[PDB]
Amino acid sequence: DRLDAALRFQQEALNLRAQRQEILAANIANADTPGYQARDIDFASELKKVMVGVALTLTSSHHIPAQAVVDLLYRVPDQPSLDGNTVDMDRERTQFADNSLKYQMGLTVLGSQLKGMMNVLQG
Amino acid sequence: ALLNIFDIAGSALAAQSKRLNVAASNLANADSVTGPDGQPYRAKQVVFQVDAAPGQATGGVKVASVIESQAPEKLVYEPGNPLADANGYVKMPNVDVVGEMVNTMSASRSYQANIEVLNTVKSMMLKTLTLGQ
Amino acid sequence: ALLNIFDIAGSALAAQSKRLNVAASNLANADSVTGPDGQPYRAKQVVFQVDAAPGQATGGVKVASVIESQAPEKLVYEPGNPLADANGYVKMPNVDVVGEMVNTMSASRSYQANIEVLNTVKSMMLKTLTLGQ
Amino acid sequence: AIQGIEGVISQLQATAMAAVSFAGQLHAALDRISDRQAAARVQAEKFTLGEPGIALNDVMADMQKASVSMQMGIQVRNKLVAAYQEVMSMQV
Amino acid sequence: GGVPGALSNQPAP
Amino acid sequence: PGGVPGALSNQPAPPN
Amino acid sequence: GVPGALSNQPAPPNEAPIATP
Amino acid sequence: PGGVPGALSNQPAPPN
Amino acid sequence: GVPGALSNQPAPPNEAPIAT
Known part of the structure; x- marks a missing residue:
């Protein structure tokens, strides 16, 4: 559908921001686990990958339709801890706040596009 | 990735955290006679550089490396110690106490100032996004 | 001519953002000692001018250039640090912390005021578009 | 077309x-x-x-301007359609 | 120009 | 002619 | 390289011995 | 398999 | 002039010297 193509980029950006938000909050929650590595995703490359499948064929009514079913990069440690935990509070707190801001911005842009498509139709 | 203000203030927070860590490690090892190898502890220093990504305009703070201080190591006459030299002077670290407390206080106040800057900017950030809607 | 308010307030927002960024960069490097070239960090400040071409009555605001702040470099007596002077006078930036914090607060407030101007102007443009209907 | 280019040269002569x-x-x-x-x-x-x-x-700001321009286009379309409906309603 | 805005993406790319 | 906004131009400047 | 970057490799374990091995 | 957090795992102890 | 009123002549440049 053409409607999907217009809203594909913002939807994928919003979903990627939510996933990275979950990853950052997991990094915050597991700050005290000894031996836990701080993981993160490269937002731009994954957004390229998602932006850049074959529903199985249903011959009749009984035939069952096809059933549907990111890469994590390690953060470079800054300070060496003794328990092997590489999670840094300041870095991930700033990243968490930034991801929240960008999620809000994506919501704003997507809502503006939908509202414009709506006022085009209203009449 | 980060917004420019976010990157600058977060780099400031990380740099102040590194300076505080160096000060705390020095204050812990103030009375250490030996390391893991048989050499005296040397007071560490952290050097702040400006991470001027553009040409001379702005930039946060980065830390190139943690250097080891070059000051006369304290000599204490203990000939019975296995680490005493021919003359018998064991080497104690050059960690000064007053300087490290002053460094801890200064690092804490810079950390809090950068935190306040981020907190102030944050409201404007969230209020920017209401311009479109 | 309500459309020109878009340009005026957008220029004002950009200029205040640049001023806030410069102030934050100065604040985050108050404790720096070295630059990328080895020179001490010099506190920098923006220059505000009326964004009016010759013959234009009143416009927004624009950042002409970024200039080094005029203040004596803060001398620190540390002739043990690898960076030093002939007499051990380490040069530290002349950042006045209170001034930078007040500048950040002022920039944020002016930014928010310009956002309000833009919001009410857009509301009026919509209402004008609903003139006869 | 060959005949299309013939027509172009004819219009040039015109x-x-x-x-x-x-x-x-x-x-x-x-x-x-x-x-x-x-x-x-x-x-x-x-x-x-x-x-x-x-x-x-x-x-x-650019998103704001784009929204305003879209609304202007919508209003122009609405009026234009209203005027066309008014003209077509004329009894001859 | 020479100075990037506070609300701009990290100049460092 | 504009100038530096805020702290620098609102603190008592040197005479000359 | 820079502290806070992204790499595809986990950091080595953080061992701190008390005596030289 | 993370271990004890905080004090115990942040003290220098010989490996066993 | 009454503050907040309108005048066709600009206000003079103000200065705050330290020593007269």
């Missing part, structure tokens, strides 16, 4: 001897509005991409 419209204006307005909207969208996608130099202020 110009030699001899020696924009409302639909065109509406098409120009639609193209301008669409180009503004596409520019704002592209800048927004570039900002979401993380590329340096793109400020959130400019993105938000």
